Amino acid sequence: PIVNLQAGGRSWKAVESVVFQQLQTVAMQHGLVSEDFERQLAYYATTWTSKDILEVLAMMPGNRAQKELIQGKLNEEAERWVRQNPPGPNVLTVDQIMGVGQTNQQASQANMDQARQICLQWVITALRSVRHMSHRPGNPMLVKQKNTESYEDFIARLLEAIDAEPVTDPIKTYLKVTLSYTNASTDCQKQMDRTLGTRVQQATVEEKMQACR
Amino acid sequence: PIVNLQAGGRSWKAVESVVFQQLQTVAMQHGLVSEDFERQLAYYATTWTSKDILEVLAMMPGNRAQKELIQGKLNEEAERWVRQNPPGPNVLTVDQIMGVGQTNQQASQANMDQARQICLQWVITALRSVRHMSHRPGNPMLVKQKNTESYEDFIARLLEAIDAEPVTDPIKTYLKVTLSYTNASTDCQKQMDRTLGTRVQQATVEEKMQACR
Amino acid sequence: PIVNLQAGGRSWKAVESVVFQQLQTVAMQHGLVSEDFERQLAYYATTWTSKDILEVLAMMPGNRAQKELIQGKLNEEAERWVRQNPPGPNVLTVDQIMGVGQTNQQASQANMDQARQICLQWVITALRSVRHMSHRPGNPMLVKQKNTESYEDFIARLLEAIDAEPVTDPIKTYLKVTLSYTNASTDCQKQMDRTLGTRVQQATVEEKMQACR
Amino acid sequence: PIVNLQAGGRSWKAVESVVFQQLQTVAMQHGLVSEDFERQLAYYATTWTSKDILEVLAMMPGNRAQKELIQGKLNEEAERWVRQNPPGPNVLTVDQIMGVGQTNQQASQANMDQARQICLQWVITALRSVRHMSHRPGNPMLVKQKNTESYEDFIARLLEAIDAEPVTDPIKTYLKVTLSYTNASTDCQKQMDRTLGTRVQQATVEEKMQACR
Amino acid sequence: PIVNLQAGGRSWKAVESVVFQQLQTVAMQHGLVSEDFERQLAYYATTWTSKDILEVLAMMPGNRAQKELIQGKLNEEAERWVRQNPPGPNVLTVDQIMGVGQTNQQASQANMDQARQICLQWVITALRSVRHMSHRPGNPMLVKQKNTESYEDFIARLLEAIDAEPVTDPIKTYLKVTLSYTNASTDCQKQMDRTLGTRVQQATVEEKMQACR
Amino acid sequence: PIVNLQAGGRSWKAVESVVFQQLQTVAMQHGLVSEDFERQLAYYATTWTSKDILEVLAMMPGNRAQKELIQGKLNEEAERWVRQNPPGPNVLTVDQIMGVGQTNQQASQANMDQARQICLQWVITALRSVRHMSHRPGNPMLVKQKNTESYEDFIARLLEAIDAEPVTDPIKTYLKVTLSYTNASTDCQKQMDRTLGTRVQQATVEEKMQACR
After folding, report:
1. DSSP letter assigned to residue C4
2. Where is the protein found, in the record's own terms (chains A, B, C, D, E, F)?
3. DSSP F93
């Protein structure tokens, strides 16, 4: 974590042992590629140096292969960054962004603020990508209410499946509303279909949600 | 959390890991829509930026659908805010209030103090509204002393049922006093009815409370 | 908690999460009307704003009816305060004392110091009063050494019973000394009666205490 | 706890919740009259105000009668203090020493430093005195090595028994050395008596201690 | 831990009890020679004095012989340092680097910053070396998918085996890709060999990883 | 703990409740005379006043006799200090060193820095001496590989036995290397004796250590 000195100079601080242990238990119960770890790491890594965004991630508990997969995806982000940003006189280098050969004080500098911001972004994209590798194709379509599962529970699973997929907002909204009625059990889809006629199939996320419960 | 610098400038701080873990255990035992989480979040979110009122809520443990329901209600609050406050030159935008595209420092500014205040208000209304969706109609009327439940316990349940409903104070008071005698078991309602005659039915919250126990 | 700024201005702070959790476990094991919670809340609520003396109490775990009983007694304190202190030009209002419509900064002001002091006093009186409602009449007189209970234990129970009652010091002392010999088992009251003759009945709290054990 | 302001003025602070919980667990496992609580309270009560030396003691977990016994002994200390120090123009009053009718700030003042020092001293004497009441007469003499208890263990119990008694240093030393050989089991007292002849009975605390084991 | 005084002078601080306990539980579950302890110690030992890099390591829980092995390897590093850096007028001495006969303040000085940096480096090399002693020769080659172990799990074990070996990056990459197909079970190596023909054997770390699962 | 004021004056602080509890659990699991407690106490007692080096030790959990043995040895250190340092005009007194009749502020002074340094040294020597009393003579020689114990484990026990003895470095090195082969089981001592001939008996700590495992 960068510390802003009262003099205005900037020095470094070891990650607060409270925050580190906080992220670890969220990477030990949910996983280091799980969204819960991704959400907590991004909020607390705002002050983290490019050096502390990589070292802490490595220390976090996870399967050895997953760290290979994450650094593998992370290397994919770096090569992409070099291609999108051609070598330039003051342009950052993958090493500068990956905190290579920098003392913590030099990696906590303002010039490494862009570097720390760029680094954290690559890790989140890789984890979303490592997470996508776990997801099989068409998870939402396969999900249904087997054994007449609670309409609430079924919608929770369907929401997880759309959230799993990286489809963009305009298409994320299409899927949630469309799949909820289609994959619903005949008992409540049928009663709602008569209850709200065409409209229930029209909009299903909220109006259909309250009716089935 | 906004931090007020001695210089008078304002900077940001990651939510204290003590407070975050505090709210989470109250959102993991009672629920993230439960009143206990709503009370603790409001007290500790006074300093929270518009950005930290949304990110922390998302990190808190809850059913996936409930977060959809909360953001669904939260979007209802935003559209209502735009209609009630027409677009204006210095008027806040739903994005400004929802901390969109703002760095933590820029979201911890005084101009975002109104934005953070407006944001927190929407979340509480949604949760009360998400909570109301769980409540069926006429919960207090259905509540009674089945199996001669302790008059204390029965009043506790009845108080919870009025608190559940969003009826206004003048009508919240009507219900508590009225339903306590009506739904009471014959044994103690009858003995009190003879004991205090007309007055016991007149006022039931305190005088009837001590007598039945 | 009010924080006294070095500049001399006064700002507010969310109740330290260490102290809050401390009072809660004493309101979850002993009760929120129990003396143990009352003692810890008064010591730590010295800096608490009128707003933080009410919000934290509400968050503390307790039966729903008990909070009704506490706010019921608290309203009794407020109406009494208005009658004893007639409306005046600079006189505090029940709202000012109950931290109504005040921002935390404005409720942490010196002018609200009297208000915070007055508020805390009402809550303690109500809890003592809520606690008295639980106590049946003449608890000390009924208490005896059934099954020849340890004279120490019996005196502990008798001391609890006098402490329960709100009798004033001059009469609190009368009861402890008087009831200890009268309610004592025949075996040790008789042996002490011969051992110290008239004096043992004269003074019973300390001289009789050591002899029976 | 008094806090020394940088300006040189002195203000008050609620007992650190870390220290309070520390003393409580030592008053919940060993007892509030036990030496372990007495040792920890004295070390941490150096900064405690006369008001915080009494309130925290009351909050600590203990049998109700024991608090009566401690305040009983504490009142014995106060009456003795008045007799030894006759009423004087600037002489402290039992109330001033017992933090009566003083705001925490006024009880954290330098003039209350003597008062806080005098108060803490009375509580320790009472607890030693409350502890003595538990001790029966001649505990060390009765202690022996029943069933050939480890000479180490037997000396531990004997040391506890002399420590229990308030005999002065010149007589505390007499007892430890004298009782260790006398109460020892015949097997090791006899072998040592031949082994070191007259000297072993002469000095028994260290030379006899190593030999029996 | 060195503390940088506002005056610019430098003083010492006892290792934060939060960080110490953090490293110990990682040296009590994984081992004091395990990579997990090595990663956490290096990140938190940035501020540690040469004196605190040795004392804390000794306090950490481990087999007695392992500390002999670590100090044995540590002495190997020191003799090597003397040979590589011949005695010089301002050149550091193994004692200066090993914080011998220095007060904490004098060991927290800027001149001991190089000494603290040099010390920490030796300990990590020894632990990697102590860890290598545990590793038998050719661990990766022996590792295979016995009982058709998950291709993911098998790659995790193989990655651990290459990480175990101190082979340099150019040869670390050769091994991971080469051994994954060779040691794979016939069922998935065969199906992949037909699926991707020559290329699957060409590159096996990522393309073969997703296909077998 | 002494606190160095910004003004340059020095005041006292109650031992951080985090560090105290840290040492206690190491004096409750390993013992208050065990090396683990001795190592942690020395590192954290650098700032401790002469008064806080004695009071905290007494509070730490231990057998009553052991504290007698430790203060017994501590008195041995004091009498030795008086003899080695004859009474002098500015020479420290055992009382000054043992923090007798000094207020914490006066015991936290620079003139008591030598006194605090001298005090801590005596306690460590006594504990090493109290620990030696537990050790019987010739512990390393008696230690062997009974039931063919792991050569690693056997060397761990032998290293503990030499560490137990206070023999000086030149003779500590002689013992470890000499006893490891002599007390080894015939199976691995014999195979090593043929494997490395005369040299294996020559040096046994490292070369023989790797070979037997």
Report:
1. E
2. Virion
3. -
- The candidate with the shortest Cα–Cα distance to E78, out of E36, E40, E105, E50, is E50
Q: What does the block give as tokens for B11?
A: 């900077």
D107: number of Cβ within 10 Å: 23
Quick one: how far is CA A21 from the chain centroid?
Answer: 20
Helix or strand or coil: residue F49? coil
Would an 8 Å CB–CB cutoff place F95 in contact with chain E? no
Residue F4: strand, helix, or coil:
strand
Query: What residue of B is the nearest CA neighbor of A210?
Result: B133
The conformation of residue E91, written as its DSSP 8-state character, comes to S
Which member of F11, F59, F65 has the closest CB to residue D155?
F65
Q: Is E18 at the interface with chain F, CB within 8 A?
A: yes
**In whole angstroms, what is the distance from residue A120 CA to residue B47 CA?**
26
The answer to whether domain D2-134 and domain D139-211 are alike in fold is no
CB E61 within 8 A of CB E32: yes
| CATH number 3.30.450.40 is the correct assignment for the domain at A2-134 | no
Give the three-state DSSP class for E3: strand
CA F75 to chain centre: 18
Residues pairing with C12 in the sheet: C2
Q: Are D151 and D207 in contact (CB under 8 A)?
A: no
Q: Are A14 and E44 a contacting pair at CB < 8 A? A: yes
Angle at C21 between CA D55 and CA C43, to 5 degrees: 20
Bridge partner list, B12 = B2
Please say whether the beta carbons of C77 and C69 come within 8 A: no
Q: How big is chain D, counted in residues?
A: 213
Cβ E87 vs Cβ E136: under 8 Å: no
Q: Which of B104, E64, E101, B45 is nearest to F152 (CA)?
A: E64
> What per-residue string of b and e applies to E109-138 under the rule 16 or more CB within 10 Å gives b?
beebeebbebbbebbeebbebbbebeeeee
Please compute, for residue E172, the number of CA atoms within 13 A of its CA located in the half-sphere on the CB side.
Answer: 12
Count the neighbouring beta carbons within 10 Å of the beta carbon of residue A25.
13
Chain breaks in chain F (C to N over 2.5 A) after: none
User: Which chains touch A (3+ CB pairs under 8 A)?
Assistant: B, E
Count the helix, strand and coil residues of chain B and give each as a percent rounded to the nearest 5: 65, 5, 30
Are E55 and E78 within 8 A, CB to CB?
A: no
Look up residue F110 and give its DSSP letter: T
CA distances to B141, C64, F10 from C77, in Å = 31, 20, 49
Task: Return d(Cα B19, Cα B27) in angstroms, integer.
Answer: 12
Token pair for residue A7? 């003099």
Q: Are B37 and B58 in contact (CB under 8 A)?
A: no
Contact criterion met (CB below 8 Å) for A74 and A58: no
The C-alpha torsion from D30 through D32 and D34 to D37, rounded to 10°, is 80
Judge contact between B43 and B22, C-beta under 8 A: no
Report the candidate in A107, A5, A17 with the shortest Cα–Cα distance to residue A54: A107
Beta-ladder partners of E4 = E10
Domain limits, chain E: 2-134, 139-211
The token pair at E100 is 């011998």
Distance CA B198, CA B213 (A): 20
Report residue E153: phi and psi, to 5°.
Answer: -55, -50
- Does D contact E via 3+ CB–CB distances below 8 Å? no
Architecture of the F139-211 domain? Orthogonal Bundle (1.10)
- Chain B residues within 8 A of C69 when measuring between CB atoms: 209
Give the rounded distance of the alpha carbon of F32 from its chain centre. Answer: 10
CA distance C7 to chain B (A): 9
F14 touches chain D (CB under 8 A): yes
The pair of structure tokens assigned to A22 is 């906080």
Out of F14, F17, F133, the one facing D46 most closely (by C-beta) is F14
Strands (E), chain A: 2-4, 10-12
